[PDB]
Amino acid sequence: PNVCAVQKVIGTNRKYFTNCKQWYQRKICGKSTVISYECCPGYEKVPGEKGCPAALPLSNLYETLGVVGSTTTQLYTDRTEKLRPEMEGPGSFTIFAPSNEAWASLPAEVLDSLVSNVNIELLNALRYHMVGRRVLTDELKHGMTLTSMYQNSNIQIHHYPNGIVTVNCARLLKADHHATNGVVHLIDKVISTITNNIQQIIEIEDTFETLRAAVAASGLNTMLEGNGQYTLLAPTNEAFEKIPSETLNRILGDPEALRDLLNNHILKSAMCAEAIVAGLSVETLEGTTLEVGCSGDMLTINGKAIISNKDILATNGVIHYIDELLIPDSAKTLFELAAESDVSTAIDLFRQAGLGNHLSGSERLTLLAPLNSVFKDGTPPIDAHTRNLLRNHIIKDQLASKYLYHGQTLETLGGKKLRVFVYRNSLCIENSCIAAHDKRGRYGTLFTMDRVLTPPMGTVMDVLKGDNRFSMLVAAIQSAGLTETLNREGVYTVFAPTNEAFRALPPREWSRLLGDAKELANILKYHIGDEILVSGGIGALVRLKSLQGDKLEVSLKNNVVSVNKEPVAEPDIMATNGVVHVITNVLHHHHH
């Protein structure tokens, strides 16, 4: 009875006093916890009965400070010789009472303001912690302000979805201790008035002179002066200095890159550090996601403990000081955003082939970079041939793969025109298909691909004529009158049977070709799809209309293309007027 829980991280005095819950966080900021049991606010154990069945009497607000252990608050209240009669007297009051540890751990700046004029400033601080009406935590809505009893100065309230409540980012430790004339809330810090907006803090602090100048040049000072709830992850001078000067001046002197940079430090609502007890994904005003988390008493951004000062309060939100600059992809060159990524091998090869200048400056390009796993079994060598192929992985203009359309053509720096194939569940450029989301830089975009491109060199007939396995196919095509179809412009998919395929036909099948050139033509045309289906465009099952009219059933299973239950021996031989897939038996006519 009257049952409450204490969750202590081990090593500390960091405690979360709660209503007993049914699911408790195993770890708080990566540090495991022990759980304990206390009696709830205002109840005491009697020996021989379990729980805490006895309620304690209410007392006035001054006395309740003692009941919750806020004895320094009492001592200082008694010192003022003014406020204790008010706390014992008529009215309805809230006090956010700092804990003894809070008063004993004053930041040097609040100690400074008190010791200047001790009697008056202690009375003012104590009044700032109070409100002239009772307010329970049920009435503490996120983002509200309460008017304190010091000069009508606002107190800022946050009430996060995980139940943590903060008062000027001080954590509310023990809530809703009723008094005969109000309520006592025990808080974790001594709070002070909030007099500057975010822009004013930028303009005051010498650690933000570089940020200040960037904000001014971008024109963002208007927003940071305005009404709003923001978190600024404010980069210090030291953060900017860690960036090579040629990178930084490139970003700061370009209005689009400068604005994306600054926006990538701003979140759309105010977030006190004490809110964060596990990983949380947030989105910046630039659009990038950051992983906010924590390790002990250190806030982390993407796992890196780069927050050197937490919870600097402004009238329009919260500032946390950050030691590294959060450069978004949209401010980067292609080399900057790709060199340490899933395509870093491919990026290294562009560099070794003398093509790095395309990636390191302001050229408007799209880069087709295969994944590192493509090069698991080795890298091509740095020739003129590899150089030339790599130049044909560099596209003119900055593109977004999602806005590409079927039949679009892309011009390369090697002078080639590559074909875009848009299928239902994949996007391919020639034989190679997009394998991850774009990374959009300032001037160029990285497309991550699953394969090295193989640009076409000749027509279908050039392909078939160049390989000894298709001599019967080439002769049959001529005999069937199909040769010039397959050497002129088109979008064919040729399931090309080898010589062993034709010799495997039984006599009853072969003898249907004898004296019947139109039957040979009909058979060959059944092997020719009327649109280009590279293997990366094949899902569970796709119908492809042949030139004979009936449809082929094409599927991909265990990374092998099949057509009418015939596996492809060698896929994706690209041609200027189609794609060739090799098969080792002739296709059987199916069901329509």
Swiss-Prot record:
Keywords from the UniProt entry: Amyloid, Amyloidosis, Cell adhesion, Corneal dystrophy, Disease variant, Disulfide bond, Extracellular matrix, Gamma-carboxyglutamic acid, Phosphoprotein, Repeat, Secreted, Sensory transduction, Signal, Vision
S-cysteinyl cysteine PTM sites in chain numbering: C20
Annotated consequence of substituting R79S: In CDGG1; late-onset; mild ocular irritation and reduction in visual acuity
The FAS1 domain, residue ranges: 58-191, 195-326, 330-453, 457-587
GO cellular component terms listed in the entry, alphabetical order: basement membrane; collagen-containing extracellular matrix; extracellular exosome; extracellular matrix; extracellular region; extracellular space; plasma membrane; trans-Golgi network
Domain EMI: 1-54
Mutation effect (L473R): In CDL1; severe phenotype; delayed age of onset
Post-translational modification summary for this protein: Gamma-carboxylation is controversial. Gamma-carboxyglutamated; gamma-carboxyglutamate residues are formed by vitamin K dependent carboxylation; these residues may be required for binding to calcium. According to a more recent report, does not contain vitamin K-dependent gamma-carboxyglutamate residues.
Outcome, altering N577H: In asymmetric lattice corneal dystrophy
InterPro entries to which the protein is assigned, alphabetical: Adhesion/Biosynth-related, EMI_domain, FAS1_dom_sf, FAS1_domain, TGFBI/POSTN
Impact upon substituting H581R: In CDL1; delayed age of onset
PANTHER family per record: PERIOSTIN-RELATED (PTHR10900), TRANSFORMING GROWTH FACTOR-BETA-INDUCED PROTEIN IG-H3 (PTHR10900:SF82)
Function as written in the Swiss-Prot or TrEMBL entry: Plays a role in cell adhesion. May play a role in cell-collagen interactions.
UniProt name for this protein: Transforming growth factor-beta-induced protein ig-h3
Lineage: Eukaryota, Metazoa, Chordata, Craniata, Vertebrata
Gene: TGFBI
